[PDB]
Design a binder for this molecule. Structure first.
Ligand SMILES: C[C@H](c1ccccc1)[C@H](C[C@H](O)CN1CCN(Cc2ccc3c(c2)OCO3)C[C@H]1C(=O)NC(C)(C)C)C(=O)N[C@H]1c2ccccc2C[C@H]1O
Lengths: 99, 99
């Protein structure tokens, strides 16, 4: 579809069996999800945002459905105010910016 | 243009008569640039993102050229890790997300 930017570009995603709302963020290099108890092994990581760094948990090869489009990749889980779908996954669903 | 997301969506902007590089950020509500001098009065403001809040200077109705397209709106200046073009200006140049 085509998403305008008058408001935050929020979409429905499916991960670990749960449906959530996530922001399509072209400015984010990685995908960061709100704290959730995902199964599997993970490794610690520090990611930097506008006002500093936060500590997150990195999970690899996690299947995720974005607005009906299947994708699979790395997901970082930590104390984020909102779920963020970054470029690592946006490229997978063939998302582009146009003007 | 149509921009893919395999690489950071960076573009050249012209502001205050100077050239700079900036990130097209659909996850950013406002536009924030690195510390620099801008003509006109400014008001102190606080914006929050991942990592926390930072103090910035708000300049209103500032003309800015983004990749050849003209826009005139609010521009925040402060200790941001990188130059970001948010939705307030992206909407002015008719930017949309597509997939
Ligand atoms: C989700 C987040 C959000 C928080 C709270 C409410 C809504 C969205 C967005 C994110 C922003 O799109 C992308 N942002 C641009 C600057 N660079 C910087 C960067 C680059 C390189 C780095 C680094 C940090 O650290 C080490 O290397 C960080 C990047 C970011 O936060 N990335 C991760 C992977 C951690 C998610 C964000 O910060 N948004 C705010 C925002 C932004 C600008 C102006 C106004 C406002 C208000 C908000 O909308």
């Amino acid at each position: 579809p085509q998403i305008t930017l008058w408001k935050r570009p929020l979409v429905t995603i499916r991960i670990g069996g749960q449906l959530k709302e996530a922001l399509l963020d072209t400015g984010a290099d990685d995908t960061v999800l709100e704290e959730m108890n995902l199964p599997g092994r993970w490794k610690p990581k520090m990611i930097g945002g506008i006002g500093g760094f936060i500590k997150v948990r990195q999970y690899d090869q996690i299947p995720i459905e974005i607005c009906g489009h299947k994708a699979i990749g790395t997901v970082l889980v930590g104390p984020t105010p909102t779920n963020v779908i970054g470029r690592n996954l946006l490229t997978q669903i063939g998302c582009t910016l146009n003007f």
